[PDB]
From Swiss-Prot, chain A:
Phenotype upon changing R74K: No effect on ADP-ribosylation
Tree of life domain: Eukaryota
Effect on the protein upon substituting R42E: Impairs ubiquitination by CRL2(KLHDC3) E3 ligase complex. Impairs ubiquitination by CRL2(KLHDC3) E3 ligase complex
Organism from which the protein derives: Homo sapiens (Human)
Entry's localization field: Cytoplasm; Nucleus; Mitochondrion outer membrane
Span of domain Ubiquitin-like: 1-76
The protein's name: Ubiquitin
UniProtKB/Swiss-Prot annotation, chain B:
Places the protein is found: Cytoplasm; Cytoplasmic vesicle, Autophagosome; Lysosome; Cytoplasm, Myofibril, Sarcomere, M line
Domain UBA per the UniProt entry, residue ranges: 6-50
Highest taxon, organism lineage: Eukaryota
Name of this protein: Next to BRCA1 gene 1 protein
Induction data: Upon viral infection.
Processing and modification events after translation: (Microbial infection) Cleaved by S.pyogenes SpeB protease; leading to its degradation. Degradation by SpeB prevents autophagy, promoting to S.pyogenes intracellular replication.
Subunit-structure text: Homooligomer and heterooligomer. Interacts with TRIM55. Interacts with titin/TTN. Interacts with RNF29, USP8, MAP1LC3A, MAP1LC3B, MAP1LC3C, GABARAP, GABARAPL1 and GABARAPL2. Binds to ubiquitin and ubiquitinated proteins. Interacts with SQSTM1. Interacts with TAX1BP1. Interacts with IRF3; this interaction mediates autophagic degradation of IRF3. Interacts with IL12A and IL12B. (Microbial infection) Interacts with Influenza A virus protein PB1; this interaction promotes NBR1-mediated selective autophagic degradation of MAVS.
Organism from which the protein derives: Homo sapiens (Human)
Role description: Ubiquitin-binding autophagy adapter that participates in different processes including host defense or intracellular homeostasis. Possesses a double function during the selective autophagy by acting as a shuttle bringing ubiquitinated proteins to autophagosomes and also by participating in the formation of protein aggregates. Plays a role in the regulation of the innate immune response by modulating type I interferon production and targeting ubiquitinated IRF3 for autophagic degradation.
Signal peptide start and end residues: none
Record comment regarding domains: The PB1 domain mediates interaction with SQSTM1.
């Protein structure tokens, strides 16, 4: 099932995920195209955080759902 | 150099936060001033308040 990822840059990425797709693997599907590290990748769903050890079904994520991607950069 | 930054940008940032799941312009405003307009920190800071 295809879902959409909204970035702070105003970009909407489309991904093909399965009901048994772990959040950690979702980050991998972004990492290959964006190049952004999964550890820095933070997905927000309805104002809630998505645990890497959880599945899409855990957060009732269905088809055409929009996930927000925010990164917390560290300097020093 | 510049004369002044467009404060209207704050509205665009606010909208991006409302699309997630907060809908609190007050909390957003007090957070933006906390990190000198840092959307990346605001969203992640707010998430630390309600992540359970």
């Amino acid at each position: 099932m295809q879902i959409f990822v909204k970035t702070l840059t105003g970009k909407t990425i489309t991904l093909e995920v399965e009901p048994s797709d772990t959040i950690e693997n979702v980050k991998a599907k972004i990492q290959d195209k964006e190049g952004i590290p999964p550890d820095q990748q933070r997905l927000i769903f309805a104002g809630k955080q998505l645990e890497d050890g959880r599945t899409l079904s855990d957060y009732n994520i269905q088809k055409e759902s929009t996930l927000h991607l925010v990164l917390r950069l560290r300097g020093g | 150099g510049p004369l002044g930054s467009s404060e209207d940008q704050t509205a665009a940032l606010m909208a991006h936060l409302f699309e997630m799941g907060f809908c609190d312009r007050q909390l957003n405003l007090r957070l933006l001033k906390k990190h000198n307009y840092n959307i990346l920190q605001v969203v992640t800071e707010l998430l630390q308040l309600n992540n359970n």
